[PDB]
Amino acid sequence: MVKQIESKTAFQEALDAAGDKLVVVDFSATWCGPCKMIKPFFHSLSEKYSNVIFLEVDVDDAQDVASEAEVKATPTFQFFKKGQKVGEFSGANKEKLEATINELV
């Protein structure tokens, strides 16, 4: 399914429950409209890819984690693995997520 991150504490514990499988992260903005209209797409992979762990961070409620990756352009997606960043990209291209998932699959 998905998991909303409140800060970095939950972020680390989240990668712990992931184990070693892939772990994508959605950095969007709730106060924003357009950046929020793309959430039904990312959260869609949750049920379409039960073999992937999808997280949901808010640069407003979890601005502490956003400063870590220094996200200055939402929406943005990051690919984590074993707690190690292996790929990432920014752009309102939710469709690209498909070709991207087949990148580190």
mmCIF file of N, CA, C and O in Angstrom:
data_model
loop_
_atom_site.group_PDB
_atom_site.id
_atom_site.type_symbol
_atom_site.label_atom_id
_atom_site.label_comp_id
_atom_site.label_asym_id
_atom_site.label_seq_id
_atom_site.Cartn_x
_atom_site.Cartn_y
_atom_site.Cartn_z
ATOM 1 N N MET A 1 0.863 -1.216 0.000
ATOM 2 C CA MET A 1 0.000 0.000 0.000
ATOM 3 C C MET A 1 0.887 1.250 0.000
ATOM 4 O O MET A 1 1.815 1.361 -0.777
ATOM 5 N N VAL A 2 0.609 2.191 0.867
ATOM 6 C CA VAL A 2 1.434 3.438 0.926
ATOM 7 C C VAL A 2 1.637 3.837 2.390
ATOM 8 O O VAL A 2 1.025 3.284 3.283
ATOM 9 N N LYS A 3 2.497 4.790 2.650
ATOM 10 C CA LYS A 3 2.736 5.215 4.061
ATOM 11 C C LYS A 3 3.133 6.692 4.089
ATOM 12 O O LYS A 3 4.082 7.103 3.449
ATOM 13 N N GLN A 4 2.415 7.493 4.829
ATOM 14 C CA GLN A 4 2.748 8.943 4.901
ATOM 15 C C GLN A 4 3.904 9.145 5.880
ATOM 16 O O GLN A 4 3.877 8.668 6.998
ATOM 17 N N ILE A 5 4.926 9.846 5.468
ATOM 18 C CA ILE A 5 6.095 10.079 6.368
ATOM 19 C C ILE A 5 5.904 11.395 7.126
ATOM 20 O O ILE A 5 5.593 12.417 6.546
ATOM 21 N N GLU A 6 6.090 11.377 8.420
ATOM 22 C CA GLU A 6 5.923 12.627 9.222
ATOM 23 C C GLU A 6 7.274 13.332 9.356
ATOM 24 O O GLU A 6 7.349 14.544 9.403
ATOM 25 N N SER A 7 8.341 12.585 9.419
ATOM 26 C CA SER A 7 9.685 13.215 9.551
ATOM 27 C C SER A 7 10.765 12.228 9.102
ATOM 28 O O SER A 7 10.501 11.289 8.379
ATOM 29 N N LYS A 8 11.981 12.436 9.527
ATOM 30 C CA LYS A 8 13.080 11.512 9.127
ATOM 31 C C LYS A 8 13.028 10.251 9.992
ATOM 32 O O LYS A 8 13.445 9.187 9.580
ATOM 33 N N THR A 9 12.516 10.361 11.187
ATOM 34 C CA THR A 9 12.437 9.167 12.072
ATOM 35 C C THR A 9 11.613 8.080 11.381
ATOM 36 O O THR A 9 12.020 6.938 11.293
ATOM 37 N N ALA A 10 10.460 8.429 10.886
ATOM 38 C CA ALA A 10 9.609 7.422 10.195
ATOM 39 C C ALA A 10 10.269 7.022 8.874
ATOM 40 O O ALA A 10 10.145 5.902 8.420
ATOM 41 N N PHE A 11 10.972 7.930 8.253
ATOM 42 C CA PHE A 11 11.643 7.603 6.962
ATOM 43 C C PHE A 11 12.621 6.448 7.177
ATOM 44 O O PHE A 11 12.617 5.473 6.453
ATOM 45 N N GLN A 12 13.464 6.551 8.167
ATOM 46 C CA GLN A 12 14.444 5.459 8.428
ATOM 47 C C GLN A 12 13.695 4.180 8.799
ATOM 48 O O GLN A 12 13.941 3.123 8.253
ATOM 49 N N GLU A 13 12.781 4.266 9.725
ATOM 50 C CA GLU A 13 12.015 3.055 10.134
ATOM 51 C C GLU A 13 11.256 2.499 8.928
ATOM 52 O O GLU A 13 11.022 1.310 8.825
ATOM 53 N N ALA A 14 10.870 3.344 8.012
ATOM 54 C CA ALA A 14 10.131 2.855 6.815
ATOM 55 C C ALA A 14 11.070 1.999 5.964
ATOM 56 O O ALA A 14 10.706 0.939 5.493
ATOM 57 N N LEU A 15 12.280 2.445 5.772
ATOM 58 C CA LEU A 15 13.247 1.655 4.962
ATOM 59 C C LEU A 15 13.565 0.354 5.701
ATOM 60 O O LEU A 15 13.991 -0.619 5.113
ATOM 61 N N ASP A 16 13.359 0.333 6.990
ATOM 62 C CA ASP A 16 13.645 -0.900 7.774
ATOM 63 C C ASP A 16 12.598 -1.968 7.449
ATOM 64 O O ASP A 16 12.917 -3.120 7.236
ATOM 65 N N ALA A 17 11.352 -1.590 7.416
ATOM 66 C CA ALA A 17 10.279 -2.580 7.110
ATOM 67 C C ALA A 17 10.344 -2.973 5.632
ATOM 68 O O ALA A 17 9.858 -4.014 5.236
ATOM 69 N N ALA A 18 10.937 -2.150 4.812
ATOM 70 C CA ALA A 18 11.028 -2.481 3.362
ATOM 71 C C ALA A 18 11.903 -3.723 3.177
ATOM 72 O O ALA A 18 11.671 -4.532 2.300
ATOM 73 N N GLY A 19 12.906 -3.884 3.998
ATOM 74 C CA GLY A 19 13.794 -5.076 3.872
ATOM 75 C C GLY A 19 14.865 -4.809 2.813
ATOM 76 O O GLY A 19 15.841 -4.128 3.062
ATOM 77 N N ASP A 20 14.695 -5.345 1.631
ATOM 78 C CA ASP A 20 15.704 -5.130 0.546
ATOM 79 C C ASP A 20 14.983 -4.934 -0.790
ATOM 80 O O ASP A 20 15.604 -4.830 -1.829
ATOM 81 N N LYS A 21 13.679 -4.883 -0.773
ATOM 82 C CA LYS A 21 12.928 -4.695 -2.045
ATOM 83 C C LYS A 21 13.037 -3.233 -2.489
ATOM 84 O O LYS A 21 13.539 -2.393 -1.768
ATOM 85 N N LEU A 22 12.578 -2.923 -3.671
ATOM 86 C CA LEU A 22 12.662 -1.517 -4.160
ATOM 87 C C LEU A 22 11.818 -0.614 -3.248
ATOM 88 O O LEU A 22 10.914 -1.067 -2.573
ATOM 89 N N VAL A 23 12.107 0.662 -3.226
ATOM 90 C CA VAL A 23 11.330 1.597 -2.361
ATOM 91 C C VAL A 23 11.270 2.976 -3.014
ATOM 92 O O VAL A 23 12.201 3.753 -2.936
ATOM 93 N N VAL A 24 10.175 3.291 -3.652
ATOM 94 C CA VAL A 24 10.042 4.625 -4.304
ATOM 95 C C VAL A 24 9.479 5.619 -3.288
ATOM 96 O O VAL A 24 8.944 5.237 -2.266
ATOM 97 N N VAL A 25 9.597 6.893 -3.558
ATOM 98 C CA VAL A 25 9.068 7.922 -2.608
ATOM 99 C C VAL A 25 8.426 9.053 -3.406
ATOM 100 O O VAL A 25 8.965 9.507 -4.392
ATOM 101 N N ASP A 26 7.271 9.507 -2.987
ATOM 102 C CA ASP A 26 6.573 10.610 -3.721
ATOM 103 C C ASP A 26 6.662 11.907 -2.915
ATOM 104 O O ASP A 26 6.038 12.055 -1.884
ATOM 105 N N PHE A 27 7.423 12.859 -3.393
ATOM 106 C CA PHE A 27 7.547 14.165 -2.678
ATOM 107 C C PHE A 27 6.637 15.180 -3.376
ATOM 108 O O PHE A 27 6.999 15.755 -4.383
ATOM 109 N N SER A 28 5.454 15.394 -2.855
ATOM 110 C CA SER A 28 4.497 16.361 -3.487
ATOM 111 C C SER A 28 4.160 17.478 -2.499
ATOM 112 O O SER A 28 4.819 17.651 -1.493
ATOM 113 N N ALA A 29 3.135 18.238 -2.787
ATOM 114 C CA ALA A 29 2.733 19.357 -1.881
ATOM 115 C C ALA A 29 1.207 19.362 -1.735
ATOM 116 O O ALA A 29 0.481 19.456 -2.704
ATOM 117 N N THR A 30 0.717 19.263 -0.528
ATOM 118 C CA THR A 30 -0.759 19.263 -0.323
ATOM 119 C C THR A 30 -1.301 20.681 -0.514
ATOM 120 O O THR A 30 -2.247 20.900 -1.246
ATOM 121 N N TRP A 31 -0.711 21.646 0.134
ATOM 122 C CA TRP A 31 -1.193 23.048 -0.015
ATOM 123 C C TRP A 31 -1.281 23.400 -1.502
ATOM 124 O O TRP A 31 -1.994 24.302 -1.894
ATOM 125 N N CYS A 32 -0.558 22.696 -2.331
ATOM 126 C CA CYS A 32 -0.594 22.988 -3.796
ATOM 127 C C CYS A 32 -1.728 22.192 -4.446
ATOM 128 O O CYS A 32 -2.119 21.143 -3.972
ATOM 129 N N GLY A 33 -2.263 22.688 -5.531
ATOM 130 C CA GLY A 33 -3.381 21.976 -6.222
ATOM 131 C C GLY A 33 -2.829 21.031 -7.303
ATOM 132 O O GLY A 33 -2.967 19.831 -7.186
ATOM 133 N N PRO A 34 -2.230 21.592 -8.334
ATOM 134 C CA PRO A 34 -1.676 20.783 -9.437
ATOM 135 C C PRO A 34 -0.733 19.699 -8.893
ATOM 136 O O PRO A 34 -0.862 18.536 -9.219
ATOM 137 N N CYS A 35 0.209 20.067 -8.071
ATOM 138 C CA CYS A 35 1.146 19.046 -7.520
ATOM 139 C C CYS A 35 0.356 18.007 -6.721
ATOM 140 O O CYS A 35 0.814 16.905 -6.495
ATOM 141 N N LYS A 36 -0.831 18.350 -6.291
ATOM 142 C CA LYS A 36 -1.657 17.385 -5.505
ATOM 143 C C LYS A 36 -2.567 16.599 -6.454
ATOM 144 O O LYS A 36 -3.004 15.510 -6.148
ATOM 145 N N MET A 37 -2.865 17.146 -7.600
ATOM 146 C CA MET A 37 -3.754 16.429 -8.556
ATOM 147 C C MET A 37 -3.017 15.222 -9.145
ATOM 148 O O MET A 37 -3.607 14.389 -9.806
ATOM 149 N N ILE A 38 -1.733 15.122 -8.917
ATOM 150 C CA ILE A 38 -0.948 13.973 -9.466
ATOM 151 C C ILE A 38 -0.773 12.898 -8.383
ATOM 152 O O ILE A 38 -0.048 11.939 -8.558
ATOM 153 N N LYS A 39 -1.444 13.025 -7.262
ATOM 154 C CA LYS A 39 -1.294 11.981 -6.204
ATOM 155 C C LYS A 39 -2.125 10.711 -6.510
ATOM 156 O O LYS A 39 -1.726 9.644 -6.093
ATOM 157 N N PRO A 40 -3.248 10.814 -7.215
ATOM 158 C CA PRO A 40 -4.053 9.615 -7.511
ATOM 159 C C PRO A 40 -3.296 8.742 -8.517
ATOM 160 O O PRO A 40 -3.633 7.596 -8.738
ATOM 161 N N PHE A 41 -2.269 9.280 -9.119
ATOM 162 C CA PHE A 41 -1.475 8.496 -10.102
ATOM 163 C C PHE A 41 -0.420 7.689 -9.344
ATOM 164 O O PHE A 41 -0.381 6.476 -9.409
ATOM 165 N N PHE A 42 0.432 8.357 -8.619
ATOM 166 C CA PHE A 42 1.485 7.640 -7.846
ATOM 167 C C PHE A 42 0.827 6.636 -6.899
ATOM 168 O O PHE A 42 1.193 5.478 -6.856
ATOM 169 N N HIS A 43 -0.139 7.069 -6.138
ATOM 170 C CA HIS A 43 -0.818 6.140 -5.193
ATOM 171 C C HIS A 43 -1.467 5.002 -5.997
ATOM 172 O O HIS A 43 -1.859 3.991 -5.450
ATOM 173 N N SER A 44 -1.568 5.157 -7.289
ATOM 174 C CA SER A 44 -2.174 4.078 -8.121
ATOM 175 C C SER A 44 -1.226 2.878 -8.148
ATOM 176 O O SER A 44 -1.643 1.741 -8.069
ATOM 177 N N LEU A 45 0.051 3.129 -8.265
ATOM 178 C CA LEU A 45 1.035 2.010 -8.303
ATOM 179 C C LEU A 45 0.891 1.160 -7.037
ATOM 180 O O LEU A 45 1.224 -0.007 -7.019
ATOM 181 N N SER A 46 0.407 1.742 -5.977
ATOM 182 C CA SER A 46 0.252 0.981 -4.705
ATOM 183 C C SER A 46 -0.513 -0.326 -4.947
ATOM 184 O O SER A 46 -0.107 -1.382 -4.501
ATOM 185 N N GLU A 47 -1.629 -0.266 -5.627
ATOM 186 C CA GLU A 47 -2.432 -1.506 -5.868
ATOM 187 C C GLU A 47 -2.003 -2.189 -7.173
ATOM 188 O O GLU A 47 -2.234 -3.367 -7.364
ATOM 189 N N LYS A 48 -1.396 -1.470 -8.078
ATOM 190 C CA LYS A 48 -0.979 -2.099 -9.367
ATOM 191 C C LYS A 48 0.372 -2.802 -9.193
ATOM 192 O O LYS A 48 0.702 -3.712 -9.929
ATOM 193 N N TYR A 49 1.153 -2.388 -8.226
ATOM 194 C CA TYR A 49 2.491 -3.025 -7.992
ATOM 195 C C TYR A 49 2.630 -3.389 -6.511
ATOM 196 O O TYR A 49 3.330 -2.734 -5.765
ATOM 197 N N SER A 50 1.971 -4.431 -6.081
ATOM 198 C CA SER A 50 2.072 -4.833 -4.649
ATOM 199 C C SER A 50 3.473 -5.378 -4.364
ATOM 200 O O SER A 50 3.789 -5.752 -3.251
ATOM 201 N N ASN A 51 4.319 -5.429 -5.361
ATOM 202 C CA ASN A 51 5.705 -5.951 -5.156
ATOM 203 C C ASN A 51 6.667 -4.774 -4.990
ATOM 204 O O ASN A 51 7.870 -4.934 -5.027
ATOM 205 N N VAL A 52 6.137 -3.590 -4.808
ATOM 206 C CA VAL A 52 7.003 -2.379 -4.635
ATOM 207 C C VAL A 52 6.526 -1.594 -3.411
ATOM 208 O O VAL A 52 5.351 -1.557 -3.107
ATOM 209 N N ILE A 53 7.432 -0.962 -2.704
ATOM 210 C CA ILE A 53 7.036 -0.173 -1.495
ATOM 211 C C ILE A 53 6.952 1.307 -1.881
ATOM 212 O O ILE A 53 7.932 1.909 -2.272
ATOM 213 N N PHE A 54 5.783 1.894 -1.787
ATOM 214 C CA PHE A 54 5.615 3.336 -2.161
ATOM 215 C C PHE A 54 5.408 4.184 -0.905
ATOM 216 O O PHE A 54 4.589 3.877 -0.065
ATOM 217 N N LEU A 55 6.146 5.262 -0.780
ATOM 218 C CA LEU A 55 6.003 6.161 0.409
ATOM 219 C C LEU A 55 5.348 7.470 -0.042
ATOM 220 O O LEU A 55 5.184 7.719 -1.220
ATOM 221 N N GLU A 56 4.975 8.313 0.886
ATOM 222 C CA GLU A 56 4.331 9.613 0.515
ATOM 223 C C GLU A 56 4.810 10.699 1.482
ATOM 224 O O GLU A 56 4.381 10.765 2.618
ATOM 225 N N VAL A 57 5.710 11.544 1.040
ATOM 226 C CA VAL A 57 6.242 12.629 1.926
ATOM 227 C C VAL A 57 5.650 13.978 1.519
ATOM 228 O O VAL A 57 5.406 14.239 0.358
ATOM 229 N N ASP A 58 5.436 14.844 2.478
ATOM 230 C CA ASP A 58 4.880 16.203 2.186
ATOM 231 C C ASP A 58 5.963 17.237 2.500
ATOM 232 O O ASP A 58 6.445 17.324 3.612
ATOM 233 N N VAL A 59 6.365 18.009 1.530
ATOM 234 C CA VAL A 59 7.434 19.016 1.780
ATOM 235 C C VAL A 59 6.947 20.074 2.779
ATOM 236 O O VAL A 59 7.689 20.959 3.160
ATOM 237 N N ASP A 60 5.712 19.987 3.212
ATOM 238 C CA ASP A 60 5.176 20.986 4.198
ATOM 239 C C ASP A 60 5.109 20.347 5.590
ATOM 240 O O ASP A 60 5.475 20.952 6.577
ATOM 241 N N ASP A 61 4.640 19.131 5.677
ATOM 242 C CA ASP A 61 4.547 18.458 7.008
ATOM 243 C C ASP A 61 5.873 17.764 7.328
ATOM 244 O O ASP A 61 6.269 17.666 8.474
ATOM 245 N N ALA A 62 6.560 17.281 6.323
ATOM 246 C CA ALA A 62 7.869 16.584 6.547
ATOM 247 C C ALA A 62 8.990 17.383 5.880
ATOM 248 O O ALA A 62 9.908 16.828 5.308
ATOM 249 N N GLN A 63 8.925 18.686 5.949
ATOM 250 C CA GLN A 63 9.988 19.518 5.321
ATOM 251 C C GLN A 63 11.357 19.083 5.850
ATOM 252 O O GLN A 63 12.383 19.419 5.294
ATOM 253 N N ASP A 64 11.381 18.338 6.921
ATOM 254 C CA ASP A 64 12.685 17.884 7.481
ATOM 255 C C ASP A 64 13.302 16.841 6.547
ATOM 256 O O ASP A 64 14.500 16.803 6.349
ATOM 257 N N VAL A 65 12.493 15.999 5.969
ATOM 258 C CA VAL A 65 13.031 14.963 5.044
ATOM 259 C C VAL A 65 13.304 15.600 3.679
ATOM 260 O O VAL A 65 14.219 15.219 2.977
ATOM 261 N N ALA A 66 12.516 16.569 3.300
ATOM 262 C CA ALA A 66 12.732 17.232 1.983
ATOM 263 C C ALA A 66 14.103 17.910 1.975
ATOM 264 O O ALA A 66 14.795 17.925 0.976
ATOM 265 N N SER A 67 14.502 18.472 3.084
ATOM 266 C CA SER A 67 15.829 19.147 3.141
ATOM 267 C C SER A 67 16.937 18.111 2.948
ATOM 268 O O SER A 67 18.004 18.414 2.455
ATOM 269 N N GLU A 68 16.690 16.887 3.329
ATOM 270 C CA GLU A 68 17.729 15.832 3.162
ATOM 271 C C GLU A 68 18.075 15.702 1.679
ATOM 272 O O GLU A 68 19.204 15.888 1.273
ATOM 273 N N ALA A 69 17.104 15.391 0.866
ATOM 274 C CA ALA A 69 17.364 15.253 -0.595
ATOM 275 C C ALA A 69 17.346 16.641 -1.239
ATOM 276 O O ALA A 69 17.561 16.788 -2.426
ATOM 277 N N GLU A 70 17.092 17.659 -0.464
ATOM 278 C CA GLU A 70 17.060 19.038 -1.027
ATOM 279 C C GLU A 70 16.104 19.081 -2.219
ATOM 280 O O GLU A 70 16.494 19.376 -3.332
ATOM 281 N N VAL A 71 14.849 18.792 -1.997
ATOM 282 C CA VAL A 71 13.865 18.818 -3.118
ATOM 283 C C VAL A 71 13.346 20.245 -3.305
ATOM 284 O O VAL A 71 12.570 20.741 -2.512
ATOM 285 N N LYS A 72 13.771 20.909 -4.353
ATOM 286 C CA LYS A 72 13.314 22.312 -4.612
ATOM 287 C C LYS A 72 12.418 22.334 -5.852
ATOM 288 O O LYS A 72 12.262 23.349 -6.499
ATOM 289 N N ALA A 73 11.827 21.218 -6.187
ATOM 290 C CA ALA A 73 10.940 21.174 -7.383
ATOM 291 C C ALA A 73 9.975 19.993 -7.254
ATOM 292 O O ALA A 73 10.347 18.854 -7.449
ATOM 293 N N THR A 74 8.736 20.260 -6.928
ATOM 294 C CA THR A 74 7.729 19.163 -6.777
ATOM 295 C C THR A 74 6.829 19.139 -8.029
ATOM 296 O O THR A 74 6.658 20.164 -8.659
ATOM 297 N N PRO A 75 6.254 17.993 -8.359
ATOM 298 C CA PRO A 75 6.430 16.715 -7.626
ATOM 299 C C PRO A 75 7.792 16.089 -7.972
ATOM 300 O O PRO A 75 8.420 16.444 -8.952
ATOM 301 N N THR A 76 8.246 15.156 -7.175
ATOM 302 C CA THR A 76 9.561 14.503 -7.451
ATOM 303 C C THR A 76 9.512 13.050 -6.974
ATOM 304 O O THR A 76 8.823 12.721 -6.028
ATOM 305 N N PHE A 77 10.236 12.175 -7.633
ATOM 306 C CA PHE A 77 10.243 10.729 -7.240
ATOM 307 C C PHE A 77 11.683 10.265 -7.017
ATOM 308 O O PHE A 77 12.581 10.621 -7.755
ATOM 309 N N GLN A 78 11.907 9.474 -5.994
ATOM 310 C CA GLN A 78 13.288 8.974 -5.694
ATOM 311 C C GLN A 78 13.269 7.446 -5.594
ATOM 312 O O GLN A 78 12.318 6.856 -5.125
ATOM 313 N N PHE A 79 14.325 6.805 -6.033
ATOM 314 C CA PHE A 79 14.400 5.308 -5.972
ATOM 315 C C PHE A 79 15.416 4.901 -4.904
ATOM 316 O O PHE A 79 16.606 5.099 -5.063
ATOM 317 N N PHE A 80 14.958 4.336 -3.814
ATOM 318 C CA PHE A 80 15.890 3.914 -2.720
ATOM 319 C C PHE A 80 16.005 2.386 -2.705
ATOM 320 O O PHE A 80 15.111 1.678 -3.122
ATOM 321 N N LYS A 81 17.105 1.878 -2.216
ATOM 322 C CA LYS A 81 17.298 0.401 -2.157
ATOM 323 C C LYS A 81 18.238 0.076 -0.993
ATOM 324 O O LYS A 81 19.326 0.608 -0.896
ATOM 325 N N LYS A 82 17.821 -0.785 -0.107
ATOM 326 C CA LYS A 82 18.685 -1.141 1.053
ATOM 327 C C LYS A 82 19.138 0.139 1.761
ATOM 328 O O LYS A 82 20.178 0.178 2.390
ATOM 329 N N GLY A 83 18.364 1.186 1.664
ATOM 330 C CA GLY A 83 18.750 2.463 2.332
ATOM 331 C C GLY A 83 19.831 3.166 1.511
ATOM 332 O O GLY A 83 20.620 3.929 2.034
ATOM 333 N N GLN A 84 19.876 2.910 0.226
ATOM 334 C CA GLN A 84 20.907 3.555 -0.651
ATOM 335 C C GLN A 84 20.229 4.118 -1.902
ATOM 336 O O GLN A 84 19.593 3.401 -2.649
ATOM 337 N N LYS A 85 20.364 5.393 -2.141
ATOM 338 C CA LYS A 85 19.735 5.994 -3.350
ATOM 339 C C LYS A 85 20.401 5.415 -4.597
ATOM 340 O O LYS A 85 21.611 5.416 -4.718
ATOM 341 N N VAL A 86 19.621 4.908 -5.522
ATOM 342 C CA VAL A 86 20.196 4.308 -6.770
ATOM 343 C C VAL A 86 19.663 5.052 -8.000
ATOM 344 O O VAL A 86 20.142 4.865 -9.100
ATOM 345 N N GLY A 87 18.681 5.893 -7.828
ATOM 346 C CA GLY A 87 18.133 6.637 -8.999
ATOM 347 C C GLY A 87 17.090 7.650 -8.527
ATOM 348 O O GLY A 87 16.527 7.525 -7.458
ATOM 349 N N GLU A 88 16.830 8.656 -9.316
ATOM 350 C CA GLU A 88 15.822 9.678 -8.915
ATOM 351 C C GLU A 88 15.581 10.640 -10.080
ATOM 352 O O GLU A 88 16.369 10.724 -11.001
ATOM 353 N N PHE A 89 14.503 11.374 -10.043
ATOM 354 C CA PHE A 89 14.221 12.336 -11.148
ATOM 355 C C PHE A 89 13.047 13.241 -10.754
ATOM 356 O O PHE A 89 12.286 12.926 -9.861
ATOM 357 N N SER A 90 12.902 14.366 -11.415
ATOM 358 C CA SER A 90 11.783 15.310 -11.089
ATOM 359 C C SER A 90 11.019 15.658 -12.369
ATOM 360 O O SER A 90 11.583 15.707 -13.445
ATOM 361 N N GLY A 91 9.739 15.901 -12.261
ATOM 362 C CA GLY A 91 8.937 16.247 -13.473
ATOM 363 C C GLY A 91 7.488 15.795 -13.276
ATOM 364 O O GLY A 91 7.223 14.768 -12.683
ATOM 365 N N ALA A 92 6.548 16.553 -13.771
ATOM 366 C CA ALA A 92 5.117 16.166 -13.614
ATOM 367 C C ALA A 92 4.759 15.100 -14.652
ATOM 368 O O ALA A 92 3.670 15.083 -15.189
ATOM 369 N N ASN A 93 5.674 14.208 -14.940
ATOM 370 C CA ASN A 93 5.401 13.132 -15.944
ATOM 371 C C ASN A 93 5.087 11.824 -15.213
ATOM 372 O O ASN A 93 5.905 10.929 -15.140
ATOM 373 N N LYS A 94 3.906 11.709 -14.668
ATOM 374 C CA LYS A 94 3.539 10.463 -13.936
ATOM 375 C C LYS A 94 3.627 9.262 -14.884
ATOM 376 O O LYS A 94 3.853 8.145 -14.464
ATOM 377 N N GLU A 95 3.443 9.481 -16.157
ATOM 378 C CA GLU A 95 3.511 8.346 -17.122
ATOM 379 C C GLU A 95 4.947 7.824 -17.207
ATOM 380 O O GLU A 95 5.178 6.646 -17.388
ATOM 381 N N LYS A 96 5.913 8.691 -17.077
ATOM 382 C CA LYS A 96 7.331 8.239 -17.151
ATOM 383 C C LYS A 96 7.617 7.256 -16.016
ATOM 384 O O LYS A 96 8.485 6.412 -16.118
ATOM 385 N N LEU A 97 6.897 7.355 -14.932
ATOM 386 C CA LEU A 97 7.138 6.422 -13.795
ATOM 387 C C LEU A 97 7.135 4.985 -14.316
ATOM 388 O O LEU A 97 7.832 4.131 -13.809
ATOM 389 N N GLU A 98 6.358 4.711 -15.325
ATOM 390 C CA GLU A 98 6.313 3.327 -15.874
ATOM 391 C C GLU A 98 7.696 2.949 -16.406
ATOM 392 O O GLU A 98 8.340 2.046 -15.909
ATOM 393 N N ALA A 99 8.155 3.634 -17.416
ATOM 394 C CA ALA A 99 9.495 3.318 -17.986
ATOM 395 C C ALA A 99 10.560 3.430 -16.893
ATOM 396 O O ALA A 99 11.578 2.767 -16.936
ATOM 397 N N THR A 100 10.341 4.266 -15.916
ATOM 398 C CA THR A 100 11.346 4.418 -14.830
ATOM 399 C C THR A 100 11.339 3.169 -13.944
ATOM 400 O O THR A 100 12.375 2.642 -13.589
ATOM 401 N N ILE A 101 10.179 2.692 -13.582
ATOM 402 C CA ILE A 101 10.111 1.477 -12.721
ATOM 403 C C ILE A 101 10.813 0.314 -13.428
ATOM 404 O O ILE A 101 11.453 -0.507 -12.802
ATOM 405 N N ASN A 102 10.706 0.238 -14.726
ATOM 406 C CA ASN A 102 11.376 -0.873 -15.457
ATOM 407 C C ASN A 102 12.870 -0.568 -15.549
ATOM 408 O O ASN A 102 13.643 -1.327 -16.100
ATOM 409 N N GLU A 103 13.277 0.546 -15.009
ATOM 410 C CA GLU A 103 14.715 0.925 -15.050
ATOM 411 C C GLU A 103 15.486 0.145 -13.982
ATOM 412 O O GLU A 103 16.470 -0.510 -14.263
ATOM 413 N N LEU A 104 15.047 0.230 -12.753
ATOM 414 C CA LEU A 104 15.743 -0.483 -11.635
ATOM 415 C C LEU A 104 14.929 -1.709 -11.213
ATOM 416 O O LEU A 104 15.113 -2.243 -10.137
ATOM 417 N N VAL A 105 14.036 -2.162 -12.047
ATOM 418 C CA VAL A 105 13.222 -3.357 -11.679
ATOM 419 C C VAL A 105 14.148 -4.560 -11.486
ATOM 420 O O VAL A 105 13.795 -5.436 -10.715
#
